[PDB]
Design a protein around this nucleic acid. Structure first.
Ligand SMILES: [Zn+2]
Ligand SMILES: [Zn+2]
Lengths: 117, 209, 248, 271, 539
DNA sequence: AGTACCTAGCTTAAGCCTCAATAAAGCTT
DNA sequence: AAGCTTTATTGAGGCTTAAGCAGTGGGTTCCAGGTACT
C-alpha cells in the first residue's frame, strides 16, 4: 500500500474531510467551512505502518557528504558516477537504530548518489 | 473452550475437597484425589451447556465428628452472583437444619450481596470464593507453613502456660487467604509450625483479628 | 553500567569519527597506570571516577535515613525474663529469641554430617556394626569388646539410637531441601572433641576405653540438661524439643 | 517453575512463555489501513479470499507479519475468535489462509461510522489480550546455575542431585493467575513483590518471602548477617496481621504511645 | 565590600532563545518542547513557552500568563492565519511527506470549530492569569499576551506577527520531528544548551530591577509633589540608597534579590592556587541533596571546557565546577553586523519568502531567533569562517554552527557561551607555521602577541556548539602523518591536551598515572595547602 | 537635625469526584 | 400481583497534598524605616 495525504479545499484552502455518497456509493472528501465537493482518488483514506518498515534513503540528504566528521572509505565506489570514494554512517533515527545498517553517500560533487549495502 | 472448562472445574473440585479435608470434614479418599478422566466420566466432559454444568457438583460434606453440621458447597451458574440468586441458596439452606455453607463465584461478587453475606452471619454462616482462588491449594505452597486450628481448651492452656492475654499474641487478618481457607472466625488462635534454619522447628501462634 | 555514552552527536568526544563503536572511542583503556593514559583515556577514566564519587556522596543521605527508620521501629523490642521477645506493649514477637533463644555471639558455622551422605554411606559411617570381631578388637579394649558382644540389650540400644538418626536424617532433609549443611550452632562440637583429644593425650592408634553405652546414655542425659524452655507440661516439652531440635 | 515434562523441554517452555506474556495485536500486526469498498465481492485490493463473503462499505484492512505470528504460536482463526468474542456480532472478521506470507484480516461493522471504525481501531491495537495475562511484560526464560533455583531432588540411594530444569522469570507480577496456568509448579513458584504475596499467600508466607528477599539483597555481595536479626525484622513487620511498613504510615498506626510516635519523623501531629 | 573580598561565582543556566524537546515520561505528555525566550537588553526576564504533545495525539501550548493548555491551532488562528493550508505551510515545510501530516491531523481537527481570528483571540483570553471581564478588555489582553509575552526574542511589534508565527511553526515542526525521532531528543546536560552568567550578566540583572525601583520611587515623589501644585526637587527625587545599598547588600550577603543565595562568596585566600580556583568557579543552579545523578555526572561536553578532576567531594559533587585553563567565556556582542552581512549576501528574510522554497534550503538562526533562509549552506560557512579568520566583521567569540544532517545553520552571539581557542587545520596541515613561532619567541620586541596570532587566522575560539561539528586531533605528530587512515579530514587540532585540566589539577605531577578519585581529592586539598598566598600579606 | 514614638523528586494515605447494581415507587396489563 | 422500569443509592475505582530526607566546627551579614515635630 501507500501513505495518504491531506486533501485541501479550493475556495477557503482548508483541509477536506472524507465522506460517503448515499446514492452513488462512492467516497468523497468534503469541506466543513464552505460546501466544496470533489471526486476521491483512492479508497485508502487512513493507513498505519507500525512495523517501522522505514526506508531511510529518502530521509538521507546528499548534503551530508560535506561533513568532515563522517568516516570515509575508498572501498566502495559510487554506482552512478563511479566515484570510488563514499562516506558511511548509521541510521541516525529513533524508532530504529536496532540494526547496524550502513548507509553510503557518494562524496563526489554534483552527484550526491546514496545507497545501502 | 470446553476441555479447559472441565479441567478448571476438576481443579476447583480437587481444591474444595482438599479444603474440606483440611478443615476437618468427612472426605472420601478417592474423592480427595480423583483423576481428571474420572471426573470427566462421572460428570460428562462438556461443561459448555452439557452434563457437567454447575449446580450438579454441589458437594455435601459432614464433619468428622458430630456429623450434624455441613457446608454443602455451591457453584452459581452466572459469573456475577447477586442477592436474588443467593436467596435461592438461602431458601435451600433453611430447607435443611445446618448453618455453614460455601459458594464459589466466577467473577467479582456484588458489594450489596457482600453486605448481605454479613447480614446473616449469626443465623447461618456463608463464605464466598473466587474461581482463581480455588485453582491452587495455597497450603501446598512451600512458602505457606502448616496452619493448625487450636481448640478452646488448647488456647486456654497456652494462655495459662505463657501467662499472657489474647491481646498480646501476634494476630492474623480475618481476610487472610489462609484464614479464609480454614474459614476461621475472629478470636481463634491458630498455631503455625514452620521449619527454622537455626532451631529446626518453630511453633508460633496467631490470633484472629 | 555501560560504555561511555555519545555525549556529542554520535561520538563520545569530538576527536573520534561519528558512529565509532571501537574500544578506544567508547571508553576502553588499554594502557596501565604505569604507562599513563592518553588524554582521551584520561577523560574517560574521569568518567568512571566521577560516577564513583557521586555514588559515595548520594549513598550517605539515602542510607542514613534507613537505619533511623529501622531503629525507631524496633527501639523497644527486648527479651523478657521468660526468654520471650516482647515489644514495649508486651506483645510477644517471638516466643524465643531468634526462634531458639541463643545469642548471636557464641555461635559458629558448623557442618551437619547427617546431611548429604548416601543411604549406604550413612549406614556405613554411623551404624556401629557390632557383629564384626576384628573391628571391635581394634577400636575397644577387650573387656569392653566382650561386654558389647555378649549382651544383647546394649546391641538393642545401639540399634535404637541409629533408628533416631534415620528419623533425624529425614527431618533434616525436610528442613533443608537444598543440599547444604553450613549451619550456625552455639557449641563447636568438632573443635571441642579435637580440643579434648589434645588435652588428654589420646594417641588414637591404641584401642579406646569408653563404653559405647556410656556415649548413648551421656548424650541423652546431656540433651536433658540443655534446657531452653522450662516446665514439664507437654506444651513446654514440645517447645523445648523444637528449640534444640537442630542442635540435638 | 515448570511442573513436569515442560521443565525439561525448551519447546514446551516456549509454549508456556507464549501463554504467559501479554500479547496484543500491536505487537503482532505489521500495518493497518481502512478502505471504502461498497462491493466486498470486488475489493480494491483484488485479492483472492474476497469470495468468502459470498454490512458497511468501509472496512478495516490489517496485515499481520509471519515472524511474530510464528513466535507467538498463534493461528489466524484464534485472533478472529478473540475479536468476535470481544466485540460480539457488531463486527465481522474474514481472515486469510496460509497461502501466502501476507496475513490479511478484513473487518467490517454492521454499519456505524468510519471515524468510529478508526476509534475502535485504536481500541483494538491495545487490549484484546491475545495471549498471556495482564500486568505483565516480556518474560525471560533460562536455565539456572545456583542450586537455590535448581530443582534439588533426593535419589533413591539418599543422595542429593541438582536437576537443571528450565525456569521462567517474568517482568510483571501476578500470582493467583499464573499459578492457575497448566504445567506450572504451584508449590515452588515464588514472587518478587511483597504486597502481591500478602494478597495471595497470606501474612505468614510473606514473613518467609520477605525473609528470603531481604536475605537475597543482603547476601548478594557476599556479606553475611545472622539469621536472628533477619527473623526479628520480618516478625515485627508481621506481628500485627498486616504489612507494617517502616514509615510514619505504618509505625505510627499501632498503639505504642504518643511519645513513641512523636519521637519519629512526625512529632506535632501525633502529640 | 565593607573590606571583604567578594567573588561572583558564575551561575550556569539553560540557553535562552533555543528550542528544546524533552520527554516528560511521567506526565501526560509524550514529548514536550520549550524555549526560554528572552530578548537581549530587555528588562523583563525570560518567559518559557511550552509546546507539548499529548500522550494517548493532540498538540497543546502552555503560554505565559495563561493557565490552560491552549491548542496550537488556536494560537495560529489568533495570529491572523485562518486557512488550514497556511498553518500547515508554517508548520510542515514539505507537501510530499504524508506521514507528518497524518500525525498532526488530530491537532488540526481538534479546533476546526474556531475559524475566526476574533474567536481564537477570545479563547486565548479565556482562562488567563488575569481573567477578562467580557468580550471587551479580553480581546486586548490576549493581543497583549501574544504581542509582548510569548516569543519576545523574535520581535515585539505589530508587524512581527508573521515572524512569531514562523518561529512557532518551527517549534511545532521540531516537536513533530522529535515525536517521529528523525531528530534525536535534546539533553539537559549538554553544555551547548547552557550559558554561564558571569559578573556582567548578574550585575545587569540586579541593576535592571534596582533601577526600576529607583524610577518607581522617583514617580512616587513626583506624584506627591505635583498634587500640591508645586515643583518637585529632582535632587531629592532620586535617592542614592536604593541604587547603592542594593548592590552592597547583594554582594556582601550573597542573597541575589531583595531568591537564590551563594552567588557572591568570600574570596579564599589561603593559597594563590586557591585564590585562582575561587575566581574560576562555576556553580550549578540545581539544588543540593538530590538523589538524581545526571546533573552531577561528568558530561562528554566538559572536555577542555571545565576541569574534569576538580570538584568538591562533599554533597556538591559535579554541581560546583572549576573552569579549565584555556577556557574562555564569550562576553557577547551585538548581532546587528551579522544581520547586515547576511542581508548583504543572498539571504532572504522571512517576510519576503514563499512557504514552498523553505524545505529545499537551510534555515538561518541568529542568537536563536530565526532570521531567514539561504539556498547554499556551503560557501556561506566558508565565507563566515573566512571573515572569522580575518576579524573583518564577525568577532572571534561569535560561533557559527552548520547542522548538516538537518538543513539548519545557527549563529550564536550570546554573552555566556563557553569557548576555547584551537588550532586551525587545512587539508592535512596546521596553519601554525615556523615563522609564527619565530615571531612569537621574540615578544616585547616585535609586539607580536596572542591577538596577532588570532588575527592571523591560525587559531580560533570554538565553543561547545561548534565542537559537535569539528574533527579535532590530539597532536600534529600523530594525526597528520599518512597511516592506515582514521579520518584524514581533521578541521582543528588541540593545542595541548594538558590544557583540559583546571588550575588546581594542573599542579599534579603525572596526573594521568594516578586514579581519578585521587586527582579529585588532590584538587580539593590543593586549595587547603598553606603557603605564601599573596606577596603583600604583611599589609 | 536629633531623637523619641508609631507601625528535585519520590510516596502514601486522604479527601474528593464519578459510575454501575438495586430495592423502593408507581405504572401496567 | 409477579414482573418490568425508574430513581435514588450506596459501596466501589481514580485524582491532589503534606512530609519526611545522616553526623561537628569556622566565617560573614543582618537585625527599622519613615514620617513628624520641635
Ligand atoms: Zn472549503
Ligand atoms: Zn555519486
Amino acid at each position: 500500500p501507500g501513505f495518504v495525504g491531506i486533501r485541501f479545499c479550493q475556495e477557503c484552502n482548508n483541509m477536506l474531510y472524507p465522506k460517503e455518497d448515499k446514492e452513488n456509493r462512492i467516497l468523497l472528501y468534503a469541506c466543513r467551512n464552505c460546501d466544496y465537493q470533489q471526486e476521491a482518488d483512492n479508497s485508502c483514506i487512513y493507513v498505519n505502518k507500525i512495523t517501522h518498515e522505514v526506508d531511510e534513503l529518502t530521509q538521507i540528504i546528499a548534503d551530508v557528504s560535506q561533513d568532515p566528521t563522517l568516516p570515509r572509505t575508498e572501498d566502495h565506489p559510487c554506482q552512478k558516477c563511479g566515484h570510488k570514494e563514499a562516506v558511511f554512517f548509521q541510521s541516525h533515527s529513533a524508532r530504529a537504530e536496532d540494526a547496524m545498517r550502513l548507509y553510503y553517500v557518494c562524496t563526489a560533487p554534483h552527484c550526491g548518489h546514496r545507497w545501502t549495502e | 473452550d470446553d476441555e479447559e472448562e472441565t479441567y478448571r472445574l476438576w481443579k476447583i473440585r480437587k481444591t474444595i475437597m482438599q479444603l474440606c479435608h483440611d478443615r476437618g470434614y468427612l472426605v472420601t479418599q478417592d474423592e480427595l484425589d480423583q483423576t481428571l478422566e474420572e471426573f470427566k466420566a462421572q460428570f460428562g466432559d462438556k461443561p459448555s451447556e452439557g452434563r457437567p454444568r454447575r449446580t450438579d457438583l454441589t458437594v455435601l460434606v459432614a464433619h468428622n465428628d458430630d456429623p450434624t453440621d455441613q457446608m454443602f458447597v455451591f457453584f452459581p451458574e452466572e459469573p456475577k452472583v447477586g442477592i436474588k440468586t443467593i436467596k435461592v441458596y438461602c431458601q435451600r439452606m433453611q430447607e435443611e437444619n445446618i448453618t455453614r455453607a460455601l459458594i464459589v463465584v466466577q467473577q467479582g461478587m456484588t458489594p450489596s450481596a457482600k453486605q448481605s453475606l454479613v447480614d446473616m452471619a449469626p443465623k447461618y454462616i456463608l463464605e464466598q470464593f473466587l474461581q482463581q482462588e480455588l485453582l491452587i491449594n495455597i497450603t501446598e505452597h512451600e512458602l505457606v507453613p502448616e496452619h493448625v486450628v487450636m481448640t478452646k481448651e488448647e488456647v486456654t492452656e497456652l494462655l495459662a502456660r505463657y501467662k499472657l492475654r489474647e491481646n498480646q499474641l501476634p494476630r492474623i487478618q480475618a481476610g487472610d487467604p489462609v484464614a479464609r481457607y480454614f474459614g476461621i472466625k475472629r478470636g481463634q488462635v491458630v498455631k503455625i509450625i514452620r521449619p527454622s534454619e537455626t532451631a529446626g522447628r518453630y511453633i508460633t501462634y496467631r490470633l484472629v483479628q | 553500567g555501560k560504555r561511555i555514552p555519545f555525549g556529542f552527536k554520535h561520538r563520545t568526544l569530538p576527536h573520534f569519527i561519528k558512529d565509532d563503536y571501537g574500544p578506544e572511542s567508547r571508553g576502553f583503556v588499554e594502557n596501565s597506570y604505569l604507562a599513563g593514559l592518553t588524554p582521551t583515556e584520561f577523560f574517560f577514566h574521569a568518567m568512571g571516577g566521577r560516577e564513583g564519587l557521586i555514588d559515595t556522596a548520594v549513598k550517605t543521605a539515602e542510607t542514613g535515613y534507613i537505619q533511623r527508620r529501622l531503629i525507631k521501629s524496633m527501639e523497644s523490642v527486648m527479651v523478657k525474663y521468660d526468654a520471650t521477645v516482647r515489644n514495649s506493649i508486651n506483645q510477644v514477637v517471638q516466643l524465643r529469641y531468634g526462634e531458639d533463644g541463643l545469642a548471636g555471639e557464641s555461635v559458629e558455622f558448623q557442618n551437619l554430617a547427617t546431611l548429604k551422605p548416601s543411604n549406604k554411606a550413612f549406614e556405613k559411617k554411623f551404624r556401629f556394626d557390632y557383629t564384626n570381631e576384628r573391628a571391635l578388637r581394634r577400636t575397644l579394649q577387650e573387656d569392653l569388646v566382650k561386654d558389647v558382644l555378649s549382651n544383647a540389650h546394649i546391641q538393642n540400644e545401639l540399634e535404637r539410637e541409629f533408628e533416631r538418626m534415620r528419623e533425624d536424617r529425614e527431618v533434616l532433609r525436610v528442613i533443608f531441601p537444598t543440599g547444604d549443611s553450613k549451619v550456625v550452632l552455639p557449641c563447636n562440637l568438632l573443635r571441642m572433641i579435637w580440643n579434648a583429644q589434645k588435652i588428654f593425650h589420646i594417641n588414637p592408634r591404641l584401642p579406646s576405653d569408653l563404653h559405647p553405652i556410656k556415649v548413648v546414655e551421656g548424650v541423652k542425659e546431656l540433651s536433658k540438661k540443655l534446657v531452653i524452655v522450662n516446665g514439664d507440661d507437654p506444651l513446654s516439652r514440645q517447645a523445648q524439643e523444637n528449640a534444640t531440635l537442630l542442635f540435638n | 517453575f515448570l511442573l513436569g515434562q515442560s521443565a525439561r523441554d525448551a519447546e514446551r517452555a516456549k509454549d508456556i512463555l507464549c501463554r504467559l506474556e501479554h500479547t496484543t495485536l500491536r505487537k503482532v500486526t505489521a500495518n493497518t489501513a481502512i478502505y471504502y469498498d461498497p462491493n466486498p465481492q470486488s475489493t480494491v485490493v483484488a485479492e483472492d479470499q474476497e469470495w468468502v463473503n459470498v454490512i458497511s462499505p468501509w472496512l478495516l484492512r490489517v496485515e499481520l507479519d509471519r515472524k511474530h505470528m510464528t513466535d507467538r504460536k498463534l493461528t489466524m482463526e484464534q485472533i478472529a475468535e478473540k475479536i468476535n468474542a470481544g466485540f460480539g456480532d457488531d463486527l465481522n472478521c474474514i481472515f486469510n489462509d496460509d497461502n501466502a506470507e501476507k496475513l490479511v484480516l478484513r473487518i467490517r461493522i454492521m454499519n456505524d461510522d468510519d471515524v468510529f471504525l478508526r476509534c475502535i481501531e485504536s481500541n483494538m491495537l491495545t487490549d484484546m489480550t491475545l495471549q498471556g495475562i495482564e500486568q505483565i511484560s516480556k518474560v525471560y526464560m533460562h536455565l539456572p546455575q545456583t542450586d537455590n533455583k535448581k530443582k534439588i531432588i533426593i535419589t533413591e540411594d539418599g543422595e542429593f542431585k541438582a536437576l537443571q530444569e528450565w525456569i521462567l522469570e517474568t517482568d510483571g507480577v501476578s500470582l493467583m493467575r499464573v499459578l492457575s496456568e497448566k504445567d506450572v509448579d504451584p508449590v515452588r513458584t515464588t514472587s518478587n513483590d511483597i504486597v502481591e504475596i500478602f494478597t495471595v499467600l497470606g501474612i505468614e508466607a510473606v514473613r518467609k518471602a520477605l525473609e528470603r528477599e531481604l536475605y537475597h539483597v543482603i547476601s548478594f555481595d557476599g556479606s553475611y548477617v545472622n539469621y536472628r536479626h533477619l527473623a526479628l525484622l520480618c516478625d515485627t513487620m508481621t506481628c500485627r496481621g498486616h504489612l507494617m511498613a517502616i514509615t510514619r504510615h505504618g509505625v505510627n498506626r499501632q498503639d505504642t504511645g504518643p511519645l513513641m510516635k512523636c519521637s519519629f519523623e512526625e512529632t506535632v501531629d501525633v502529640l | 565590600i565593607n573590606g571583604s573580598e567578594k567573588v561572583l561565582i558564575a551561575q550556569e543556566k539553560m540557553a535562552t532563545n533555543t528550542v528544546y524537546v524533552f520527554a516528560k515520561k511521567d506526565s501526560k505528555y509524550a514529548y514536550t518542547g520549550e524555549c526560554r525566550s528572552c530578548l537581549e537588553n530587555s528588562s523583563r526576564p525570560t518567559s518559557t513557552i511550552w509546546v507539548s504533545m499529548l500522550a494517548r495525539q493532540r498538540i497543546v501550548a502552555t503560554l505565559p500568563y495563561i493557565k490552560q493548555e491552549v491548542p496550537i491551532i488556536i494560537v495560529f488562528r489568533a495570529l491572523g492565519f485562518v486557512s488550514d493550508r497556511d498553518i500547515l505551510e508554517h508548520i510542515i515545510y514539505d507537501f510530499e511527506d504524508p506521514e507528518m501530516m497524518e500525525m498532526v491531523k488530530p491537532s488540526l481537527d481538534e479546533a476546526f470549530v474556531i475559524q475566526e481570528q476574533n474567536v481564537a483571540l477570545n479563547f486565548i483570553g479565556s482562562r488567563g492569569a488575569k481573567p477578562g471581564v467580557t468580550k471587551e478588555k479580553r480581546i486586548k489582553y490576549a493581543k497583549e499576551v501574544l504581542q509582548k509575552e510569548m516569543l519576545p526574542h523574535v520581535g515585539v511589534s505589530d508587524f512581527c506577527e508573521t515572524k512569531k508565527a514562523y518561529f512557532l511553526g518551527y517549534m511545532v515542526h521540531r516537536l513533530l520531528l522529535a515525536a517521529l525521532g528523525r531528530r534525536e531528543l535534546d539533553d539537559r546536560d549538554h553544555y551547548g544548551n547552557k550559558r554561564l552568567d558571569l559578573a556582567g550578566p548578574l550585575l545587569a540583572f540586579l541593576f535592571r530591577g534596582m533601577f526600576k525601583n529607583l524610577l518607581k520611587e522617583v514617580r512616587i515623589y513626583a506624584q506627591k509633589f505635583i498634587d500640591r501644585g508645586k515643583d518637585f526637587n529632582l535632587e531629592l527625587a532620586i535617592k542614592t540608597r536604593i541604587i547603592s545599598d542594593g548592590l552592597k547588600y547583594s554582594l556582601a550577603t550573597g542573597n541575589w534579590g531583595d531568591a537564590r543565595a551563594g552567588v557572591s562568596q568570600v574570596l579564599n585566600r589561603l593559597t594563590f592556587a586557591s585564590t585562582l580556583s575561587h575566581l574560576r568557579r562555576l556553580n550549578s543552579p540545581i539544588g543540593r541533596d538530590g538523589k538524581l545523578a545526571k546533573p552531577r555526572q561528568l558530561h562528554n561536553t566538559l572536555w577542555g571546557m571545565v576541569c574534569p578532576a576538580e570538584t568538591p567531594e562533599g554533597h556538591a559533587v559535579g554541581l560546583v565546577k572549576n573552569l579549565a585553563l584555556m577556557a574562555y567565556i564569550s562576553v557577547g556582542s551585538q548581532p546587528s553586523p551579522i544581520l547586515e552581512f547576511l542581508e548583504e549576501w543572498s539571504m532572504e528574510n522571512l517576510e519576503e519568502i514563499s512557504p514552498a522554497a523553505i524545505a529545499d534550503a537551510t534555515k538561518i538562526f541568529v542568537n536563536g531567533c530565526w532570521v531567514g533562509i539561504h539556498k547554499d549552506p556551503e560557501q556561506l560557512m566558508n565565507t563566515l569562517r573566512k571573515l572569522r579568520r580575518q576579524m573583518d566583521i564577525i568577532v572571534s567569540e561569535v560561533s557559527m554552527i552548520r547542522d548538516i544532517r538537518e538543513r539548519e545553520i545557527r549563529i550564536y552571539t550570546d554573552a555566556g557561551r563557553i569557548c576555547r581557542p584551537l588550532l586551525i587545520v587545512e587539508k592535512q596541515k596546521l596553519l601554525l607555521k615556523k615563522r609564527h613561532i619565530d615571531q612569537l619567541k621574540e615578544r616585547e620586541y616585535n609586539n607580536y602577541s596572542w591577538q596577532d596570532l588570532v588575527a592571523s587566522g591560525v587559531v580560533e575560539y570554538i565553543d561547545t556548539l561548534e565542537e559537535e561539528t569539528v574533527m579535532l586531533a590530539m597532536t600534529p605528530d600523530d594525526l597528520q602523518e599518512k597511516e592506515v587512515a582514521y579520518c584524514s579530514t581533521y578541521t582543528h587540532c588541540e593545542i595541548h591536551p594538558s590544557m583540559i585540566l583546571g588550575v588546581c589539577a594542573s599542579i599534579i605531577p603525572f596526573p594521568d598515572h594516578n586514579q581519578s578519585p585521587r586527582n579529585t581529592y588532590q584538587s580539593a586539598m590543593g586549595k587547603q595547602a598553606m603557603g605564601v598566598y599573596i606577596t603583600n600579606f604583611h599589609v
